[PDB]
Structure formats: C-alpha cells, structure tokens
Amino acid sequence: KSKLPKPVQDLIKMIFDVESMKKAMVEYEIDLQKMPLGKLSKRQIQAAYSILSEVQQAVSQGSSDSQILDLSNRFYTLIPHDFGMKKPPLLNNADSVQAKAEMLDNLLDIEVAYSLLRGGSDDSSKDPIDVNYEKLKTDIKVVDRDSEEAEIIRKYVKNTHATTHNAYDLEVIDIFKIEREGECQRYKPFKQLHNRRLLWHGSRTTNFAGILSQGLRIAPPEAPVTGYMFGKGIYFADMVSKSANYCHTSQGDPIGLILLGEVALGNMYELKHASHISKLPKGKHSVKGLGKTTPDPSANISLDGVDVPLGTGISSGVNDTSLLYNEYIVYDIAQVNLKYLLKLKFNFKT
Ligand SMILES: CCc1cc2ccc(CN3CCN(c4ccc(C(=O)NC)nc4)CC3)cc2[nH]c1=O
C-alpha cells in the first residue's frame, strides 16, 4: 500500500485512467474498433500530420471541393473516424485543418501515457499507484496551504480570472510542486535570461502523464505551421481562465489540471495578429501576442526570482489586436521549467 500523500495518489489515478483516455478518443469521433488506444502509434499520427500539411497546401492554393476530396479522404484513412456507412465531413478549409492538428497534438500525449502503462513490468506485490508514479520521473510534492508560495499561487488564480470567462469560477483544490528529472539541467542556459515569468499552461487531464513524463513539447516538423496562430511553439497565458479553457472540463467532469511554469521569454517579438512563423527574427527569444487586457503591471511580484503577473486585468493600451488577453510562445523546449501543478474544481454557473 502506497505511502505517497493522498492528494498525490489521487493525481496519479486521474492521469493514468484508461477509461478517460478512451473518452477523449470518443470525443474526437475516432473509431475505437478500427483504432483502439493500443494501436495508436507516433508513426501513424506523424503520417496524419503530413496529410494535413498536404490538405492545407491545397486549401491555400484555392483547390475546389472535388479536387480536395482525395486529400481529405487520405486523412480519414490514416486516423479512422466513426461515421458508420456515411461519408466523413470534408476537410476543405484552414479551420478544419487546425481542429485536426489540435486533435493529433493531444493524441501524441495520450500515446505516451498508454505506452508508459504497457511498456514496463508487472508486479502484484507493489501498489500500482507507486509503480505509475515512478514512470513519470517527476518528483511531486504537496505544497502546504499556509505556505508563502501557496498564498501567491492562490492570489494569481483569484486575480486573473477574466470577466469574459464568467461561465465558471475556479477553486484551487491541491497545489503540487513538480520537478521533472533533467529539466533543471536543460534549463541552465536560460536560468539567468531577462523576462523570466511564471505563466499558466492548461491541458486536458489525459495529457498530464505525457506532460510530466516528456515535458511541454512543440508539434512535430510534420505538423502544418498554419494550424497554429503563432507557429509551432509552446503556448502560455498570464490569465488563469485563458489557460483553464484548455482543460476542456464540463458539468460531467468538473476537475481540471493546470501548470505554472517558469518561462525564459527574454527579448519578446510582439505581435497583434496571426504569424505562422517557422523561426524567430534574430535576437528574439519568444513571441508575445498582445492582448487588449493585461494583468496590472504595478502589481507584479517575485517568487524565487521569477516575475509573477498576478495583478487584476486592466487595459494594455494596445489597439487593433486580435487577442483579448496576452499569450506567450517559446520555440525551444529548454526555455520552460515547470514549477507547479494545480488541481482545480470548476464550478459552472450555466
Ligand atoms: C495560451 C495558453 C494555452 C495555450 C495552449 C495551446 C495548446 C494546448 C494544447 N496542447 C498543445 C501541445 N500539445 C503537444 C503534445 C505533444 C507534442 C509532441 O509530442 N511533439 C513532438 N506536441 C504538442 C498537446 C496539446 C494547450 C494550451 N494551453 C494553454 O494554457
């Protein structure tokens, strides 16, 4: 029987739940009879990305629906979807491509989680929670509710929930301090870079075994760059609710997970509209998508030398931007050092 704290055991059970992984695949209309969890492979997902790149190439060149049918059909051949005996929906536009690129990104984290469960050893005498905990290669500790870092974290959640995301409110259940093995060593060239901020990153519960195991990752080279607003990087927010929307929680599953990561932003390349970049301009270390609203710059505080933008939302003074709130993107996985993992309860008001 496991000696790990009860909040840590509940976290492990939640992230390694096979029925939740199957639920996420049904949500994507994937045919689990033709392609179950065990037959999902990096090779097949990578080939599907390549077909999405071929589709996006035809859409950008104004191909007719009849011309694009063969390309669209090719994607469904690689990633079988459950449409019975009907024709699947045609992928003939940028939005369709982006939705499928986003699904494949999630499939990559789910495959990692399922591969951890299948690729080890079987020992009945050990508690499965302890066995699964060791597969993450991440030290997970419970942060004390009355500590200084907990109070700062709770303030960041309390102050940065946007008014436009008022369909739910958030309650912090557990705060975990996380240390992925080798990540601090990887982060060394960036540990003293200017503009290091503690930013949010939300994701579905089914991604967290992959995130703790492999870290935050960038979409593979096979993925279409146009499927991502600011190209293929790792995306963060300074407003808790902007990241909490990426948990995809609901009334029927109101518990979500969100990361706090130290991100070395350095010289930010400030943008107001989509830019499907492959590389940053010389001397730039990240992209900052300028939002209309920003956490009050005067209320920024420091947590272990890292700036925490926990001020309440005010006008940034930025006009003509497609973003309501800020977003930060890095294009090198080494620029991220995950610090905390929060378990949140979403209370829906709808
Ligand atoms: C603006 C704040 C924000 C943006 C945001 C944007 C997107 C996603 C969804 N994630 C993207 C990364 N993704 C990947 C998973 C695996 C791999 C891989 O194996 N690469 C080789 N690459 C990417 C999983 C799904 C979550 C987000 N959460 C936020 O809080």
Side-chain angles (χ1 to χ4, degrees), residues 2 4-147 149-184 186-350:
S2 180
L4 286 170
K6 193 63 168 37
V8 175
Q9 302 192 38
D10 293 350
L11 178 64
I12 302 309
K13 289 183 293 170
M14 188 184 176
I15 74 173
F16 281 107
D17 200 288
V18 167
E19 292 311 305
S20 298
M21 301 174 203
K22 291 180 185 166
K23 174 170 184 167
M25 287 178 76
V26 167
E27 233 169 291
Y28 285 135
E29 312 166 304
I30 287 162
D31 199 306
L32 286 177
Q33 278 277 136
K34 298 167 176 32
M35 202 203 50
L37 255 181
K39 291 162 185 181
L40 191 60
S41 72
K42 256 133 64 67
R43 184 185 295 111
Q44 288 170 114
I45 295 162
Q46 279 161 14
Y49 274 128
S50 177
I51 295 303
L52 289 186
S53 295
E54 198 198 12
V55 167
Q56 182 65 44
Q57 250 265 290
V59 321
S60 89
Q61 309 215 255
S63 269
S64 73
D65 281 7
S66 63
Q67 281 173 319
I68 217 153
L69 174 61
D70 285 24
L71 317 203
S72 173
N73 271 348
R74 233 113 74 187
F75 173 83
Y76 292 114
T77 301
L78 290 177
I79 306 297
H81 284 57
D82 190 19
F83 290 112
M85 291 301 119
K86 303 171 356 168
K87 291 179 193 169
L90 190 73
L91 299 167
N92 60 350
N93 63 46
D95 286 4
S96 285
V97 167
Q98 174 180 305
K100 295 303 178 185
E102 291 163 357
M103 163 194 78
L104 298 177
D105 285 10
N106 288 313
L107 291 187
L108 288 174
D109 276 330
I110 288 173
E111 186 283 325
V112 165
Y114 199 69
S115 76
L116 294 177
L117 293 170
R118 306 297 301 147
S121 284
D122 197 285
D123 186 7
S124 293
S125 74
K126 293 188 158 152
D127 186 322
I129 294 170
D130 285 331
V131 170
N132 289 341
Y133 173 79
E134 297 155 27
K135 298 183 187 310
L136 301 174
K137 307 196 189 177
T138 304
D139 184 22
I140 307 180
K141 300 175 182 198
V142 179
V143 172
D144 197 82
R145 210 215 153 81
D146 304 315
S147 60
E149 67 196 338
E151 296 167 9
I152 289 177
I153 287 166
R154 287 198 311 271
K155 185 166 188 162
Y156 201 182
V157 177
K158 188 176 166 292
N159 284 0
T160 66
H161 193 122
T163 295
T164 67
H165 304 152
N166 71 344
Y168 63 93
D169 66 43
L170 288 173
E171 183 197 356
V172 176
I173 306 302
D174 300 306
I175 308 172
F176 301 99
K177 195 166 179 72
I178 57 166
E179 206 187 343
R180 283 193 63 254
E181 160 192 314
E183 199 175 76
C184 206
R186 189 177 73 178
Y187 189 68
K188 271 201 80 168
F190 303 102
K191 73 165 172 173
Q192 298 151 324
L193 207 67
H194 69 291
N195 295 321
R196 287 172 290 113
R197 308 205 186 159
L198 197 65
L199 301 165
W200 298 108
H201 184 99
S203 212
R204 296 168 205 245
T205 301
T206 49
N207 297 58
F208 277 88
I211 293 169
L212 300 173
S213 166
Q214 301 300 315
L216 291 176
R217 294 174 291 175
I218 287 167
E222 292 90 2
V225 67
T226 60
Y228 311 87
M229 186 171 190
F230 296 111
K232 300 184 290 188
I234 308 173
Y235 289 64
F236 298 93
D238 56 19
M239 297 291 280
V240 70
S241 62
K242 176 160 177 178
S243 281
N245 290 158
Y246 286 92
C247 303
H248 291 278
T249 56
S250 50
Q251 292 85 349
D253 184 26
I255 310 298
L257 295 170
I258 192 163
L259 293 162
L260 271 174
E262 180 188 335
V263 184
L265 297 167
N267 192 14
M268 302 173 300
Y269 178 42
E270 306 186 338
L271 293 170
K272 295 168 163 188
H273 302 274
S275 196
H276 311 296
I277 59 169
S278 294
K279 200 165 180 192
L280 285 165
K282 193 169 189 178
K284 294 292 179 176
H285 306 110
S286 64
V287 156
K288 178 183 182 179
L290 305 174
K292 307 183 184 211
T293 298
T294 185
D296 195 348
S298 78
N300 281 202
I301 60 104
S302 204
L303 176 59
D304 292 309
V306 185
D307 280 335
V308 185
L310 39 66
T312 65
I314 65 162
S315 187
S316 62
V318 173
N319 311 301
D320 304 299
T321 172
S322 60
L323 295 173
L324 292 184
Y325 312 99
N326 295 325
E327 50 186 76
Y328 308 83
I329 308 96
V330 293
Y331 302 81
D332 185 335
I333 64 173
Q335 278 172 260
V336 178
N337 199 194
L338 304 179
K339 294 289 171 189
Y340 308 92
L341 178 59
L342 274 74
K343 183 165 110 185
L344 305 171
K345 174 129 178 108
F346 288 65
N347 174 39
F348 293 90
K349 313 294 244 314
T350 42

